[PDB]
A paper describes a structure:
Contractile bacteriophages of the family Myoviridae (i.e. T4), R-type pyocins and the type VI secretion system (T6SS) of Gram-negative bacteria are evolutionarily related nano-scale injection machines that puncture target cell membranes using a shared contraction mechanism. TssA subunits are enigmatic as they possess a conserved N-terminal region of unknown function, previously identified as ImpA_N (PFAM: PF0681226), whereas sequences located C-terminal to this region are highly divergent. Consistent with this, phylogenetic analysis has suggested that the TssA family can be subdivided into three clades (TssA1, TssA2 and TssA3).
The structure of a Bc TssA1B CTD domain construct (I303-S373) was determined to 3.08 Å and the asymmetric unit was observed to contain eight CTD monomers (chains A–H). Each chain folds into four α-helices (α12-α15) that lie in approximately the same plane, and form two antiparallel pairs. In the assembled Bc TssA1B CTD ring, analysis by PISA32 revealed an extensive dimer interface (~950 Å2) between monomers in the different layers, which principally involves the interaction of residues located in helices α12–α13 with their two-fold related subunits forming a region of hydrophobic packing with hydrophilic interactions at the periphery. In the crystal structure of the TssA1B CTD oligomer, the double ring is ~25 Å thick with a lumenal diameter of ~110 Å and an outer diameter of ~200 Å, in agreement with the dimensions of Bc TssA1B and purified CTD oligomers determined by negative stain EM analysis. The Bc TssA1B CTD structure shows that this motif defines a loop that connects α12 and α13, and includes a salt bridge between E324 from this motif and a conserved arginine, R306, from a symmetry-related subunit.
Numbering used by the authors:
A (entry chain D): 301 to 368
B (entry chain G), F (entry chain A): 301 to 369
C (entry chain C), E (entry chain B): 302 to 369
D (entry chain H): 299 to 367
């Protein structure tokens, strides 16, 4: 099934997760496909908030982009 | 798009990465879909070596499994 | 020859039963049953019971997208 | 008693079989590791098993005195 | 010859009784009975009454999947 | 089931040890059934040497019995 848009790619990731979740309960692949699915619709600023550890490095990037 | 086996699931992850490289090159999603496809082809004891930070916790795990520390 | 996950679990348990009637001292039975509980235990749960270091667990959880 | 020696061989071989199943179907399953370690343990005499599992040398020596080793 | 584990345990008790009736100062009577107790004692119980260090014991219980 | 004398009781302990040693390599019964047979053929002063830990308590017992190394 040729992927035509972002929401289809998300559906395909979530599906891979379902395959592994019933086929291989230990595969970390499911955990990571499901994370990738959440990331797909996460706006850059939100994504940066959760991924960047240092509050200073984060403030700097918020300044380069202009957020509050 | 009904996943019949392990190969297809990996094939699809890769295809998801290919979609985001062409459509959204700033998407972190391509990186994950690929890390995930590597992880599929990596056995448990190997995956744990790259993921567990503390050496003592990693020796403990190896001991529960039987691997040679 | 073993066909699915459930047969493998019955075999393990059956092996454990065998060693419990014949070698009450063999650790084989204990391990056979430990393995059968692991069979259907998902990765994130298995990691909880095996990783000693709280920090290494927080990290692994973060890589996997698991929430506390 | 040779029928009892062979029944353990047969049990031990089903462990190996389980581990084989899991190694080929669920490469991330820790079950493959334990099932195989269970099979090592089956052909390991008690004092060797105690040597690898009893951490503290005091408790190990005492055990050796109880058993006479 | 000895055919099964109940028959072997009987010899032990039997040996204990012969030594108790013929040589009350013999320590063999005591050890034959200890052996007979041990025969019907599961590994986890046997370890419980043999291992001295709680550290060592709790570690073994973890390896075997036993709850204290 | 008819034990006639000391030597038969010792052969018997030995046979018990061989039965468990051949059938249950993890049973501690063999080790112990064999120590019993060792003890059987050991005189009291030797048995007391291997079993009494404190050298003062042992010297004293040697005095009570009139033994000399």
């Amino acid at each position: 099934h040729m992927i035509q848009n972002r929401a289809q790619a998300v559906d395909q990731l979530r599906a891979v997760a379902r395959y592994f979740r019933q086929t291989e309960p230990h595969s970390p692949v499911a955990y990571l496909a499901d994370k990738a699915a959440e990331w797909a619709d996460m706006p850059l600023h939100k994504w940066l908030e959760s991924v960047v550890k240092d509050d200073g490095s984060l403030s700097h990037i918020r300044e380069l982009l202009g957020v509050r």
